[PDB]
Design a protein around this ligand. Structure first.
Ligand SMILES: *C(=N)Cn1c(N2CC3(C2)CC(F)(F)C3)c(-c2ccc(F)c(Cl)c2)c(=O)n(-c2cncc(Cl)c2)c1=O
Length: 299
């Protein structure tokens, strides 16, 4: 059992390099618009507290260089939308996939295509944490890398990378330029909230373990939503709702294991630990697989 990303080809053909003066980062080219982080218009002296509006007045169309590999795009308009710039270009991307922009909820997963200088370098699976950070793997130059899901033909873009916080976790926006959580595109102290564990995801992963033949943690007990939620609170797990129970319905049905029974098994794991045993080759409880992801990789 492994985190698996979506095939990246459809997004790879959308990545470009954006340069404003001496500042370069990655952009996303869809139809005749390139999307990128607005901090492309900054220099180092700006970063403690940029006035983006004032910085952008000194910028004309020709001050943005956009390159799609070799293909050299002509910028014919620009605007700022929240924390992204939209550069209108003369040429529609011929490789534009069917796509949508979506603002995800905490707990939801997506693939990241990490890019440097407009070139794709790696793909991996990630999650929006409850505190609205993502635990990405990004180096300097990665801004403008995107997070997405692929449903049949359609690319659903949900994340654009902006910044690494001092703690080494990552913050960024939806493709409308609104940050997830309370983060801002300046270099101030921005402490994260409690990184709580995504309970419904852990349950989904326990079901995937049963589907794949790891069953040692199935115990004799059941519990109630309220009693389980006391336990979740003590262990900094998200509260489980009836909605969560409902979305676990297919996995429950497939395995014959009532969601509240699986809850009682999780309770025991939280209270007693894993006593040196593994689940799906992991020595901790994994929370970055959704119910939806589990179905994908199991059947
Ligand atoms: C991303 N392509 C470059 N970079 C930044 N940058 C780029 C600048 C801000 C320096 C500049 F030229 F003036 C504009 C940041 C960053 C730092 C502070 C801040 F408020 C923002 Cl909005 C961004 C950054 O964090 N990273 C980054 C991203 N992911 C991982 C790492 Cl190790 C660094 C970055 O590459």
């Amino acid at each position: 059992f492994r985190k698996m990303a979506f095939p990246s080809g459809k997004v790879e053909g959308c990545m470009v390099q954006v340069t404003c003066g001496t500042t370069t980062l990655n952009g996303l080219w869809l139809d005749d618009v390139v999307y990128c982080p607005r901090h492309v218009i900054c220099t180092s002296e700006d970063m403690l507290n940029p006035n983006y509006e004032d910085l952008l007045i000194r910028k004309s169309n020709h001050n943005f260089l956009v390159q799609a590999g070799n293909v050299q795009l002509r910028v014919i308009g620009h605007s700022m939308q929240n924390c992204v710039l939209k550069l209108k270009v003369d040429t529609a991307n011929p490789k534009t996939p069917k796509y949508k922009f979506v603002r995800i909820q905490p707990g939801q997963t997506f693939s990241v295509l990490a890019c440097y200088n407009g070139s794709p370098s790696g793909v991996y699976q990630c999650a929006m944490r409850p505190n609205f950070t993502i635990k990405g793997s990004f180096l300097n130059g990665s801004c403008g890398s995107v997070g997405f899901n692929i449903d049949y033909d359609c690319v659903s873009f949900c994340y654009m990378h902006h910044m690494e916080l001092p703690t080494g976790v990552h913050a960024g926006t939806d493709l409308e330029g609104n940050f997830y959580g309370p983060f801002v595109d300046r270099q101030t102290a921005q402490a994260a909230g409690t990184d709580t564990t995504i309970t419904v995801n852990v349950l989904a992963w326990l079901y995937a373990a049963v589907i794949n033949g790891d069953r040692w943690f199935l115990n004799r007990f059941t519990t109630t939503l309220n009693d389980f939620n006391l336990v979740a609170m003590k262990y900094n797990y998200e509260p489980l709702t009836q909605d969560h129970v409902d979305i676990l319905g297919p996995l429950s049905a497939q395995t014959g294991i009532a969601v509240l029974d699986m809850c009682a098994s999780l309770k025991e794991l939280l209270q007693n630990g894993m006593n040196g045993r593994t689940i799906l080759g992991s020595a901790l409880l994994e929370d970055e697989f959704t119910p939806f992801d589990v179905v994908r990789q199991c059947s």
